[PDB]
Design a protein around this ligand. Structure first.
Ligand SMILES: Nc1nc2c(ncn2[C@@H]2O[C@H](COP(=O)(O)OP(=O)(O)O)[C@@H](O)[C@H]2O)c(=O)[nH]1
Length: 403
């Protein structure tokens, strides 16, 4: 069932590798010309795809395929022509893997290929079919995060999670009632003529034809939605306040690496009370600090509009992709301020940094010794980055590898 797309500028072995992991399909059940299932022998199954200036491939590809293999040529390196393909493929929420043709994993030791910014290279000799098992290992994993429900990439998916009676049902409509908004297990609406989807909106429709089973099945119901949403809205109870489950479902988002927002509903029904309740939230949600605290009301529409904007802001950042050149200026700037730690002689060195993921954005820092980068410096960098391009709404992770 999964769908994989080899992409890259022409004359890089795209056509070679395809035959490696190729029989064709014709008049059999499908959601599509020129589709193939995986080379039957192979460990796993999925569909391959022929995509038919390369902008046409790149879009048609990321229209119809949930894991994309972008393939350069390492005979003579990261071509000018290549960097524009990457630039096209930066506009996708789907995974991407980096095939580097004709190399020894040795000839692979090139920071240039990391720059392109889709993570680690995976070298592949093509004629001998070396280094390929690792590639399909790096691809297949993503099959485990492909949702069985799919939308156009320009659709934006989100959810209103929390404990019961807090506002979830009331508050969804108040938004839909606004004139900017224009009205299937989910609600598929538009705002400013742009598609939107509140994921599992039967979190409302089910609970009122059905006596409330128990905490377990509803939370699970919610965490399953979170797996499909890009922005979560953790929507509290303004009278009642903090607890277990709010935190529990809200902690899963950060641990899923999800764009979070903190809505405080039933604020009409509240009599300094903000900033004491804010730092009360920031105490008990001291990981969610990037995410903004909204003090709206569903019942009286108070600040109801302070919402879809904040989502778009969070959704925009969750995707937001930084230039490798600027980023390193920021990082070189980091150390000149605060020198790296001493481990009595052995000091940490930061050679080179680069973006690799999004949803949520993720950076690798290349160093002399990974464990020498203690978490303290790791966050210092994180805090520096956020004072540069904001990223206010989203989590970001910072891995680190030996050069
Ligand atoms: N009087 C009163 N009304 C409540 C109480 N709890 C909930 N409600 C009402 O029921 C609604 C519950 O909100 P809802 O959006 O359904 O939250 P959800 O059930 O978690 O989606 C509120 O807007 C309140 O008017 C309560 O303790 N007292």
């Amino acid at each position: 069932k999964p769908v994989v797309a080899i992409v890259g500028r022409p004359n890089v072995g795209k056509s070679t590798i395809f035959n490696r992991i190729a029989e064709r399909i014709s008049i059999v059940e499908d959601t599509p010309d020129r589709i193939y299932s995986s080379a039957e022998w192979l460990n796993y199954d999925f569909n391959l795809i022929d995509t038919g200036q390369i902008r046409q491939q790149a879009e048609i590809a990321m229209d119809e395929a949930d894991v994309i293999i972008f393939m350069v040529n390492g005979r003579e390196g990261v071509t000018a022509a290549d960097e524009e393909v990457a630039k096209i493929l930066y506009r996708t929420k789907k995974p991407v893997v980096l095939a580097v043709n004709k190399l020894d994993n040795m000839r692979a030791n090139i920071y240039d290929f990391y720059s392109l910014g889709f993570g680690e290279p995976y070298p592949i000799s093509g004629t001998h079919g070396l280094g390929l098992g690792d590639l399909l290992d790096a691809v297949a994993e993503h099959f485990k995060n492909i949702p069985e429900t799919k939308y156009n990439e320009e659709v934006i998916q989100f959810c209103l999670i929390g404990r019961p009676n807090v506002g979830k049902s009331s508050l969804v409509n108040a938004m839909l009632g606004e004139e900017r908004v224009i009205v299937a297990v989910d609600t598929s609406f538009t705002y400013n003529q742009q598609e939107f989807v509140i994921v599992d909106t039967a979190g409302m429709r089910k609970k009122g034809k059905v006596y409330e089973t128990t905490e377990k099945y509803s939370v699970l119901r919610a965490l399953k939605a979170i797996d499909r949403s890009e922005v979560v809205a953790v929507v509290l109870d303004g009278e009642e306040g903090i607890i277990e489950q709010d935190k529990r479902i809200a902690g899963y988002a950060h641990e899923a690496g999800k764009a979070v927002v903190i809505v405080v509903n039933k604020w009409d029904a509240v009599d300094s009370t903000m900033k004491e309740f804010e730092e009360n939230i920031r105490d008990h949600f001291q990981f969610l600090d990037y995410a903004p605290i909204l003090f709206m009301s569903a019942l009286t529409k108070k600040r109801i509009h302070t919402l879809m904007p904040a989502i778009i802001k969070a959704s925009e950042n969750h995707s937001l992709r930084v230039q490798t050149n600027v980023l390193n200026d920021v990082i070189m700037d980091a150390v000149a301020m605060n020198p790296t730690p001493t481990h009595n002689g052995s000091r940490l060195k930061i050679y080179y940094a680069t973006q690799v993921s999004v949803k949520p954005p993720s950076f690798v820092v290349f160093v002399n010794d990974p464990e020498l980068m203690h978490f303290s410096y790791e966050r210092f960098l994180e805090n520096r980055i956020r004072d540069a391009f904001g990223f206010e709404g989203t989590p970001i992770k910072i891995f680190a590898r030996a050069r």
